[PDB]
Amino acid sequence: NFTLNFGPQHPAAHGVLRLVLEMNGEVVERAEPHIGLLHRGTEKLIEYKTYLQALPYFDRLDYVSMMAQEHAYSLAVEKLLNCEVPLRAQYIRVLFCEITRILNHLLALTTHAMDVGALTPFLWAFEEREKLLEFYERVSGARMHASFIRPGGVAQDLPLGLCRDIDSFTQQFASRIDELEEMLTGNRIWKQRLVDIGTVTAQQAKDWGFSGVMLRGSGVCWDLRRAAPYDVYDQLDFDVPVGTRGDCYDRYCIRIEEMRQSLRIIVQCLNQMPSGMIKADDRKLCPPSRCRMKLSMESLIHHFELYTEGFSVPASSTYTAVEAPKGEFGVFLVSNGSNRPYRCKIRAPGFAHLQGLDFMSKHHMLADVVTIIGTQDIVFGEVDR
Amino acid sequence: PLLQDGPPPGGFAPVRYARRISNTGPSAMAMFLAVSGAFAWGMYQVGQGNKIRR
Amino acid sequence: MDNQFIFKYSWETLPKKWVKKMERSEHGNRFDTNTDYLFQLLCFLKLHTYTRVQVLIDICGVDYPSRKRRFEVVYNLLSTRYNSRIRVQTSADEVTRISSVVSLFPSAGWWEREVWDMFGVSFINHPDLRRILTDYGFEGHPLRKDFPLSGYVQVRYDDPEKRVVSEPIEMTQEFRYFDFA
Amino acid sequence: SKAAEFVISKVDDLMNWARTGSIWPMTFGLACCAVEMMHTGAARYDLDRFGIIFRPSPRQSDCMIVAGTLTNKMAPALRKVYDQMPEPRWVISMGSCANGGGYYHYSYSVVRGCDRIVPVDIYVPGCPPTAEALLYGLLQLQKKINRRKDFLHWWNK
Amino acid sequence: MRCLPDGNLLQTKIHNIGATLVGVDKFGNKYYQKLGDTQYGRHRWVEYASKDRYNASQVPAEWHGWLHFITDHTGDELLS
Amino acid sequence: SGIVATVFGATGFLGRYLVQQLAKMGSQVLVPFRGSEDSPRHLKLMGDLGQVVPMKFDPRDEDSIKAVMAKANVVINLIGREYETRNFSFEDANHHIAEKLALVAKEHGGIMRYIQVSCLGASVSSPSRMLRAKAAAEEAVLNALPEATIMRPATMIGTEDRILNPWSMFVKKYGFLPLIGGGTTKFQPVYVVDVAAAIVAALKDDGSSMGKTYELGGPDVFTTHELAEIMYDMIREWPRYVKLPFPIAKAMAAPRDFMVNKVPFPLPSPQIFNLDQINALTTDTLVSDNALKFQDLDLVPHKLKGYPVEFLIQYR
Amino acid sequence: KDWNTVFERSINTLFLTEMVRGLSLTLKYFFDPKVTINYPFEKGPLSPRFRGEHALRRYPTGEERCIACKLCEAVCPAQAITIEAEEREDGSRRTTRYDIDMTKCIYCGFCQEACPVDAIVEGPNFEFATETHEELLYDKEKLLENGDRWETEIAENLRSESLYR
Amino acid sequence: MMLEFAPIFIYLVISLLVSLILLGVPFLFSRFDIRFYLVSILFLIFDLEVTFFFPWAVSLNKIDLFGFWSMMAFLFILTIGFLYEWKRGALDWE
Amino acid sequence: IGVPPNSANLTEARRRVFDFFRAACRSIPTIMDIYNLQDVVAPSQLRYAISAQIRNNAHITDPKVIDLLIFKGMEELTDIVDHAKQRHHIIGQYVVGGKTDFLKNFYTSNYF
Amino acid sequence: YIAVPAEILGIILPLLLGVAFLVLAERKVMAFVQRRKGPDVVGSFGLLQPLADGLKLILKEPISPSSANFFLFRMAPVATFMLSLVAWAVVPFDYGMVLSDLNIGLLYLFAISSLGVYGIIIAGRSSNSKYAFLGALRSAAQMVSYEVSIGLILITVLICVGSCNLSEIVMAQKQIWFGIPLFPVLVMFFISCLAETNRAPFDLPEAEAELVAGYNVEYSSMGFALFFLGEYANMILMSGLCTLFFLGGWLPILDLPIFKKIPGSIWFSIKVLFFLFLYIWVRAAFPRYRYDQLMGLGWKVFLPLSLAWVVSVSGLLVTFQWLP
Ligand SMILES: NC(=O)C1=CN([C@@H]2O[C@H](COP(=O)(O)OP(=O)(O)OC[C@H]3O[C@@H](n4cnc5c(N)ncnc54)[C@H](OP(=O)(O)O)[C@@H]3O)[C@@H](O)[C@H]2O)C=CC1
Ligand code: SF4
Ligand code: SF4
Ligand code: SF4
């Protein structure tokens, strides 16, 4: 068996993907990924930051699903502080979580399509991505690394007229998905590239710690938004699509349907959005308004403390997970009572998924390896941290 | 202040999320008959053109 | 299948010598085992009908330099069958090898490689135990508390040798530690 | 030499026109900056409209965009690919990570700026720079290329 | 004559047809708008004074917000 | 260190090794370049942020020369050319610029150390025109600056050298390597890094280098045939030495010298058949026993075998 | 199963019918208007919250707003800010050095949030690519220059954004 | 007449000159896979089939029924061979 | 293949030490071609380097410390062979190829 | 014969301009499909983009890697480019507008197509890259595989015409265009041309993101340019062949005086342009097959159907005595 070394140093496949394949002709016998090419020491760096300063690091783990990791870190901190989040912030956080899910699925589906030779859908999808990135920028001033979801709520309230603009997007997005499906779903070349490729049984998915679409493709009804709900997810209607074959073609269909259900959640969040405060009112971790900091001695003192020392977290440890676009994203946070986390372990779904490439790609063709990587939806920021 | 961004009175208009069907396309037999008839008549025309060329 | 049932059921049915500590809390049920019983306890939790702990979520280390066994190895586990999570922990030092659970959960393979890379904890019967994250030829385990943030060496291109080379670090501006305590 | 200089200036202008109007960058997409660069090449900003075509091989490439954090592990692979680009070649550093290490400057595994490995012609700031910011950086690369006098310098050598 | 080699400038000249002149800045750059709805009603652009060697940084601050749809105030109204 | 060095001719072979070693010491390095901004590009990697500064200048212009020297307390000259261009003669590139640089250095007044890098064999009675002009610059810089220091390296060996690379390229194209004097000329080639180390050491001493000329040769003396043997074992190719006596060697090297100053357009540079170097191959060039060697600089040269010839792997 | 339904799929396969719709829908956008922006004559939309090039501001009298509290330096997640300060000749608490490494900065806006006098802000400018690493080491004078150049736009955004923070 | 082949030769000479100009101007400023052998074998067989079809196709007007059926028998033998290829997995690259 | 259990006693540990010495030293000809050390250092000098590292730890009596040292030795060896970072005068951690020590240090700096 | 090189250059130079503008047209059409603009800055409407790209490639330094086959590495793009050029000496654009009125023109075209594979295989082995070599082997195998179906379709047209003269093949379609009774044959021919040109959906050399390195990965400057120009000239030639064999060549759609007014060269150019548009529209519409899938299609679908159509057409023509 000869060994084919494949590292695409370009975002055709992830930029830092490196694969050592043992082949029998054009058939793969063993796929060994070499990682750490994007290992940046995030978990070590977080220990030297206050809880507020560590928040931007979570935007840069799964850099296609920014606000989702913001949400997981805030929930873990809120869990350790026993902090009550107001209802309006909960709806905003869920709304932008679902916007993030569409942003992620649009990139994952069309970069995968582009890798198997379908070049048009990427251009059609990235235009829709631009409309959604505009909503990121209008609430936070940043296209991608918003740092908008924070412990106790969100950084700022929605600008006037944003909800109407979001509603306008929802009125046409179903047609955009319909166009994406017509280019791919019924086409015989697309089916021939995806059907019966990378079959994962339910037992295999559980054994290898698979989650998200990687687990639901195998017929397992498991979604953390329903299994362990958080924020206002228990007050929203959405269906959980599951596969019947466990192949790359099933997981493609599931991501399309998840985008349709994400549209459903956004519409409900837009109509159910209540008025009220968007920060928690416990004056221990919430920054005061600019007007009170400049008028009240107590507010100025609180502002001085929050931006120099930050808030303390009582000594404890817990694991918090959310349903990120790529699967279960978890944070194991250890606090020692101080203003900096003692240990922050990040559980990345792509770490487990890419580890499953060896058994998933066994006895397939060389050209199927990229398809299987695309169906796993790998981003090496979270794999390597 | 007291004005926050949110839904209008009554909420926004309903939006569709389900896939929309589309019945565009001819029939197995229609396109078969077209091809068969074109073949027969066209090969007769080929014979006629070959006679004139000769 | 709430956290009250698991705590009460486990106390009755588990072998007594397997668990040294049991904590019930809203931060997660947590069993502290001895190193020699970690493998058997996890096999029990996975196979037993009333637990069915089929998914190993992740394995992580924690450094406690003030302890004679500085390292704590934390196993986070999930039961999709009963919709419950369980935490199992054990302690280790810089020279005590501990059992690998790859035979129980295949996903443990890379996570155990990361624990070794980041902390220096070795795993008996691990099929392929080598560093997974750090650069090749790396010295030290960076997640240890005593390991400096910026490490010991840095890389740059050296034109006379026509290659990228490693040298001891030299910072233009050192990392400033702000003591807000 | 009242007529040679006029001819030489036209030759250099023709060479600069060809090189600015046909820039074929090889994308080094290491992290989040790669996605903003993906958007720059998408319909809204259409880098193709400027003559920019992305290449998969350094052999067909004129420019290298380092978009993302460069680790010590990845550094030798970056240098090798740069050495396979045929002259004339340029490097654009995109984002704080590639510029000087950014958020991960004090880390044990991150190269503190890609200019420690390859020479850099343009630095594009931001974390990430917006897609329009990258487009501005490319237009600055065209400005530097338009200062070249390769025929004249070779004529006087 | 600049239209022949510079196709970027030609696109602006074609799209300038029928537009309304909004104002001129201190550098001579001319600001135009259409008041339509083609790219979601965004129809603001600038015709730089220098037909060659134009640069995005040549737009002054008072017109920068108008040009990027950050504000609806023109450069003239901000200066007042 | 607080040394601010203006290194002329640093965009050539020795320059890159000298700038790297000057950067290691902490010195600030100013790099005058006369053509494209691409020539000093590889030097920007050396040294920390802002320590190496390329600066455009003009050899035939004194206002530009004093512009790049105006902030320096150390000046090092590496400017020289082994062949002739229709614009720069041997005296123009190897003597006129060197003497011009010293006079501006004299006009400056703030130059603690001045080093002029010449060549081993630079003498008045030399068959080669380039070495004759070097010796003139030797005397001119000494007359203009008697406190200046001179180095006389032998043929330098390195990745970008013009002896082993032209031969290997010639062999892989024609299959045989010519010998110009029957492979009998003696000389002692030196590692390029050692030459750079010597210049740094002279800058780093307590002042004992000033006014003295150093002959820097390799540890061992070869003949041209023997050196040509080293590369053959390195490029793993079959040795096919074809002899060539001097008359015909000056025959095929005659055209470029003949037509350089007549045609109005540039010509390719000579590799093996450079009439001027062929003349210098007639007599053995060696470090004199009475001069100052690498010893008295407290440095030992590297042997050629091994690392100094590692760049020949690319030719296999 | 049935000779008609067998005939149905046989003709659909042979005549590549499902690839006809793929061609049809690829052609519809061909005659439609394009979404490409004519940069640099036309620009993409931005909000008053946009986090771009940093700037130091002054009061309308010309006095610096910054009072060297060092809150921005303490909160900066990238340690991109370096400050030195002492009492001025008139007794004022002012900085003698204010440096922002634009290559360490992650453009988070935390410094703007921490500042109690609205001295440091992230302006709307995003077109400041440079040819050298050195020019991205901003000093105090450069930041005050940026504030002078962008003051009219910054003040307008601050007025619009004052109702939210 | 072979007279129409001379312009082709001059065309080849000119095309070679253009190619050399284009390619010369820039110089101024251990695994055996049996399936490739097998695809070569099949290509060789069917290439000879196309060869024997050209005289037949231009000559159908004079050979009439006899030549048609002789070609049919030729094809029958070669198609028996092709069916043998199909059934033995020579046409499958999986 | 897999990581073995900790050695029970010093006989087991020292037996593991010799297998590592054999395996590490048998790979010197591979290392010589990888770093092109033919004209740089003799194979025996690198053999004596490995032996010297083993001897410098001959005082260790805990078998668990010996097991960890061998495991780190195998990893150091594997990175040298599989992923070589060729410097000139070093491989990995090892250099290849009339006054006391106070004045030399004193002339250098104030930090000893 | 003194005027022959003038005609030869009047063929070759406009062909090179047409190739340079076919690349621009493909970029413009793919862009318009994708709601973008494509080249529009370098010249009015991007019309100077091909000139800039060619001039850029001319000025780019040639690498010529340290291989042991330097002559073959450089000769490989020259071989494929000369082959792409020489096919146009026998192509007629109108009655009497053809350089060489070969009586064996059909077989000459088949010979050129068979020769095309050598540039690709020599590039792979001479490039000293395992990845380039395995890609070149796959591309060569695909090309020879679809040559069989191309040849069998050519035989079908030959049976209808009874002469290898391309002008006679056109003039045989005066009564009716062969694309009407042989429409499935025309579809098979267009797909076989796509696969023979290494074009989408059959563009293995463009499948770099598929871990499939092309045969020309080690080529830079004008060797790469020659490979590209050869492939696009072949695309134009395949469009011309589809026009000549099935769409009546220079003939008008209907034999009426109103159609007969405009020159036959315009008719021929219009039809060639329609097929060149299809090459791009298909590239923009579909994903690509794996190598094994397209090889299966070549040997298991297109060969049997081509052989069946040869048999059916010949049998029907000899049965009713409708032979030429
Ligand atoms: N074998 C050898 O290389 C030996 C060399 N020496 C001498 O040492 C010195 C440095 O050697 P090396 O680095 O190899 O030389 P190179 O020829 O490789 O480099 C010469 C340098 O001087 C510059 N230069 C040359 N001619 C002129 C000119 N007419 N006007 C302005 N600048 C000019 C070049 O700039 P640019 O690149 O822009 O042309 C370049 O930076 C030379 O004087 C050389 O003769 C000593 C003994 C042996
Ligand atoms: S600069 Fe910011 S956005 Fe770009 S790669 Fe680094 S962290 Fe990600
Ligand atoms: S934007 Fe963030 S990283 Fe940059 S200076 Fe301000 S606080 Fe520091
Ligand atoms: S900019 Fe603001 S926060 Fe920073 S030191 Fe000045 S006053 Fe304090």
Task: Give the spatial strand order of the biggest sheet of chain F.
Answer: 3-2-1-4-5-6-11
Distance between the termini of chain B: 94 Å
Task: Please state the overall shape of chain F, judged from the principal axes of the Cα atoms.
Answer: globular
Q: Could you give the count of β-strands of chain B?
A: 0
List the secondary-structure elements of chain B in sequence, H or E: H
* End-to-end distance of chain F: 42 Å
How many helical stretches of chain B? 1
Major sheet of chain F: 7 strands, parallel
The helix/strand series of chain F, from N terminus to C terminus, equals EHEEHEHEHEEHEEEHEEHEHHH
Detailed description of the structure:
- The structure is cut from a larger assembly and holds ten protein chains of ten kinds.
- Chain B contains one helix and no strands.
- Chain B has one helix spanning 28-53.
- Chain D has helices at 4-21, 33-40, 75-83, 95-100, 131-145, 150-155; strands at 25-29, 63-67, 90-94, 122-124.
- A four-stranded parallel β-sheet of chain D has the order 1-2-3-4.
- In chain D, helix 3 links the parallel strand 2 (63-67) and strand 3.
- In chain G, 33% of the residues lie in helices and 15% in strands.
- Chain G has a three-stranded antiparallel β-sheet. Chain G has a two-stranded antiparallel ribbon with strand order 1-4.
- In chain G, strand 2 and strand 3 (93-101) form a beta hairpin.
- Chain G is elongated.
- Chain H is mainly alpha-helical.
- Chain H has helices at residues 6-24, 34-87.
- The termini of chain H are far apart.
- The chains are: A mainly alpha (385), B mainly alpha (54), C alpha/beta (181), D alpha/beta (157), E alpha+beta (80), F alpha/beta (316), G alpha+beta (165), H mainly alpha (94), I mainly alpha (112), J mainly alpha (324).
- Chain A binds chain G through residues 49, 52-54, 56, 120, 124, 127, 134, 137-142, 145, 147, 156-157, 159, 179, 182-183, 186-188, 287, 289-290, 293-294, 300, 303-304, 307-308, and chain G through 18-19, 21-22, 25-26, 29, 35, 45-47, 49-51, 71, 74-75, 77, 106-110, 113-114, 116, 122, 162, 164-165.
- The complex binds NADPH dihydro-nicotinamide-adenine-dinucleotide phosphate and iron/sulfur cluster (3 copies).
- NADPH dihydro-nicotinamide-adenine-dinucleotide phosphate (NDP) binds at residues 9-15, 34-35, 39, 59, 78-82, 88, 93, 97, 117, 119, 153, 155-156, 162 of chain F.
- Chain D: This is NADH dehydrogenase [ubiquinone] iron-sulfur protein 7, mitochondrial.
- Chain D: Complex I is composed of at least 49 different subunits. This is a component of the iron-sulfur (IP) fragment of the enzyme.
- Chain D: Belongs to the complex I 20 kDa subunit family.
- Chain D: It is found in: Mitochondrion.
- Chain D: One of its GO terms (molecular function) is NADH dehydrogenase (ubiquinone) activity.
- Chain C: Belongs to the complex I 30 kDa subunit family.
